[PDB]
């Protein structure tokens, strides 16, 4: 089997990505936020804290004729940005882009926090890291990649984010049409439960490229580019006028600026993420300083290759029995 669904950035910022995703009998619609970096499938729902909804599209268990409690199950998160929901799970049946896998785990929440219940488009997330970060106690629950994969005519799924505009997710299938060039492919490590690789460096602008290594997540639900603090400050050096702002909270710059393109090594291939990628707009309405799309990762302590560098690439998840990464130019 493969599947296929369209991907949608949220707003004019690409802050976060939307996929419709059908979930219970008859189908309920809701769209979800497909999230390498996490591995748990959690939705707004009929058992969501009621204040803590404002707009979302919820999941109703009891409307659904497949969905069955999964008994004692409970289920708690808390994000690296500090965001943070839980509750209770189901059992329910669950397709993405015609691809259907049943007796999904659908974590229901009971509750959000804030910054959930003010983003009105994400109605919850998919995650899609390796199913040893999934949250559910005391039996945990596989991501719905893993629970497809036997299915798939590959084990495989495909990150093709747009800029500014719709990308598309495949499941079990990579489409040659969708990338230019040729697919690098390089080693993960699983042991955090990311995918985890290392890239060879980077260079800024036309500048010349950087040999060194750079371990880092593929993380479709982080919005930016996350790198050592050496990295970050030789891009931005660049930038006339761009600082840190600890007010703020990372690197600001003119919005008047034409920012230099980032390129990121993947083995002997290069990524070049554009300049116009790396602009989040003004850190407030109306200001003319503008947020960075590369950060420093020194507060965090890991690298991470966010939308920012992903949307630059048509990526592959190889969920094989020796998991790997592709880029590909696109």
């Given at each position: 089997s493969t599947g296929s669904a369209t991907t949608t950035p949220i707003d004019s910022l690409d802050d976060a990505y939307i996929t419709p995703v059908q979930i219970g009998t008859p189908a309920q619609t809701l769209n979800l936020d497909?999230?390498?970096?996490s591995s748990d499938l959690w939705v707004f729902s009929s058992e969501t804290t009621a204040s803590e909804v404002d707009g979302q599209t919820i999941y109703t268990p009891?409307?659904?004729?497949t969905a069955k409690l999964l008994s004692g199950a409970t289920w708690s998160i808390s994000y690296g940005d500090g965001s943070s929901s839980s509750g209770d799970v189901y059992t329910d049946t669950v397709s993405v882009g015609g691809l259907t896998v049943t007796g999904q785990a659908v974590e229901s929440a009971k509750k959000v926090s804030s910054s959930f219940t003010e983003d009105?488009?994400?109605?919850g997330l998919l995650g899609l890291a390796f199913?040893?970060?999934?949250?559910?106690?005391?039996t945990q629950q596989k991501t719905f990649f893993d629970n497809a994969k036997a299915s798939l005519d590959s084990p495989v799924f495909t990150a093709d984010l747009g800029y500014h505009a719709p990308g598309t997710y495949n499941f079990?299938?990579?489409?040659?049409?969708?990338?230019?060039g040729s697919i690098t492919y390089t080693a993960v490590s699983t042991k955090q439960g990311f995918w985890e690789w290392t890239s060879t460096g980077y260079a800024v602008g036309s500048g010349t490229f950087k040999s060194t290594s750079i371990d880092g997540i593929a993380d479709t639900g982080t919005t930016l580019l996350y790198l050592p603090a050496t990295v970050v400050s030789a891009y931005w050096?660049?930038?006339?006028?761009?600082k840190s702002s600890s007010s703020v909270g990372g690197y600001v710059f003119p919005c008047s600026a034409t920012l230099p393109s980032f390129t990121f090594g993947v083995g002997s291939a290069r990524i070049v993420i554009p300049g116009d990628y790396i602009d989040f707009g003004?850190?407030?309405?109306?200001?003319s300083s503008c947020f960075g799309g590369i950060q420093s990762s020194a507060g965090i302590g890991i690298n991470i290759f966010g939308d920012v560098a992903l949307k630059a690439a048509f990526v592959v998840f190889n969920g094989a029995t020796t998991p790997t990464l592709g880029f590909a130019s696109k």
């Open positions: 497909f999230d390498t970096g009891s409307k659904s004729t009105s488009t994400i109605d199913s040893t970060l999934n949250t559910v106690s005391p079990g299938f990579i489409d040659t049409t969708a990338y230019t050096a660049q930038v006339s006028g761009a003004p850190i407030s309405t109306g200001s």
